[PDB]
Design a protein around this ligand. Structure first.
Ligand SMILES: Nc1ncnc2c1ncn2[C@@H]1O[C@H](COP(=O)(O)OP(=O)(O)OP(=O)(O)O)[C@@H](O)[C@H]1O
Ligand SMILES: [Ca+2]
Ligand SMILES: [Ca+2]
Lengths: 353, 22
């Protein structure tokens, strides 16, 4: 009777047991029918679908296959015996939350459940209840100002530019450099290069000048066939897209500006706390040097006297899940679960409290 | 209020340090 925590992302599913310091099951949010890694390997005879797009569940039959694979194949637990905490994207439509609740109680027969906003869990993971979260994963990036556990709806910013977009861009600039990555197998390799050799430059223009004059910024990545992939400015030009979305033809402002615009859409009286509590969350915030860059970009945009602070935990690839593990195992939260009796009697709309 | 109590728990929870290592 230990609570389960399932954090469903656009690209990855993070599942585990409330109380653990990390999720035991992490696998691709893909359905081929095959789910996860099995579908990724046997892709030739199968067509792969992502049931979650830009953090929103858009395919319920496939999403059901993913929860089934999570409970029985990966965690090998009986859903009927465990309160289950799920996560959702900010601004998730009401109809989505109800469908999520209906499937958990009618298809998996959970005894209790809860739906928490992903960014809010990240804030908790860092011991905070007020602050602004930069949550960037594989499909979507969000700026979420939070006041004592409540996400300020009018200040939430959504940006459809995340890890997958940076992977596509890396594939393109690598080809413009001489290498050629087209097949999907070559995409999984480029994704691995991105996560292993990429970083955010403090000064992009100067880094570009430094890369063109010397080879000190060059790193090598060897493929199994013996080919050595050496890259210079591609290391920082890829994640630079976060601050200059125009690199991939997007008119939106960088993540530093969406953070500022979000803070400016909040009451002037809460901006001070937000500036001092920038929590970075998601796999796309793992690039070395991103924290120092945000510190610099935000300082240039905020009042000169403003105290800026960027919090980038080393475990931010799973901050959402960690925050949920903490939440669901606290004693003060045990009376916040939606019970089966409430659902059995009032139905799926009971999720709106 | 439990909400104030919940906010208190998160601040005094200790974070990831109080979770079982896997
Ligand atoms: N060290 C790293 N450097 C850069 N990117 C990374 C690193 N580790 C993971 N990523 C990227 O993070 C992404 C997955 O992160 P995460 O699990 O937070 O996203 P998600 O929840 O699946 O998607 P979303 O939150 O956008 O719906 C992938 O694009 C992956 O390539
Ligand atoms: Ca996520
Ligand atoms: Ca005011």
């Amino acid at each position: 009777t230990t609570a389960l925590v399932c954090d469903n992302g656009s690209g990855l599913v993070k599942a585990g047991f409330a109380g653990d310091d990390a999720p035991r099951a992490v696998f691709p949010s893909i359905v081929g029918s095959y789910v996860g890694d099995e579908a990724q390997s046997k892709r030739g005879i199968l067509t792969l679908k992502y049931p979650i797009e830009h953090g929103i569940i858009t395919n319920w039959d496939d999403m059901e296959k993913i929860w089934h694979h999570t409970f029985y194949n990966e965690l090998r637990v009986a859903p009927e015996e465990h309160p289950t905490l799920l996560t959702e994207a900010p601004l998730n439509p009401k109809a989505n939350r109800e469908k999520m609740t209906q499937i958990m109680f009618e298809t998996f027969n959970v005894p209790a459940m809860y739906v928490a906003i992903q960014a809010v869990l990240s804030l908790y993971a860092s011991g905070r209840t007020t602050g602004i979260v930069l949550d960037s994963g594989d499909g979507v990036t969000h700026n979420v100002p939070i006041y004592e556990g409540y996400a300020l709806p009018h200040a939430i910013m959504r940006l459809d530019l995340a890890g997958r977009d940076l992977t596509d861009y890396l594939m393109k600039i690598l080809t413009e450099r001489g290498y050629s990555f087209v097949t999907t197998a070559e995409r999984e390799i480029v994704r691995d290069i991105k996560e292993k050799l990429c970083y955010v430059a403090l000064d992009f223009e100067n880094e570009m000048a430094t890369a063109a004059s010397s080879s000190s910024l060059e790193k090598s990545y060897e493929l199994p066939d013996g080919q050595v992939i050496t890259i210079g400015n591609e290391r920082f030009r890829c994640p630079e897209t976060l601050f200059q979305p125009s690199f991939i033809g997007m008119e939106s402002a960088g993540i530093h500006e969406t953070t500022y615009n979000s803070i400016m859409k909040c009451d002037i009286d809460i901006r001070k706390d937000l500036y001092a509590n920038n929590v970075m969350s998601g796999g796309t915030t793992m690039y070395p040097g991103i924290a120092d860059r945000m510190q610099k970009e935000i300082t240039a945009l905020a009042p000169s006297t403003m105290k800026i602070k960027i919090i980038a935990p080393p475990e931010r690839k799973y901050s959402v899940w960690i925050g949920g593990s903490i939440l669901a195992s606290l004693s003060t939260f045990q009376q916040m679960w939606i019970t089966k009796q409430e659902y059995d009697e009032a139905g799926p709309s009971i999720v709106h409290r | 209020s439990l909400h104030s109590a919940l906010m208190e728990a998160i601040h005094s929870s200790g974070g990831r340090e109080k979770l079982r290592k896997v």
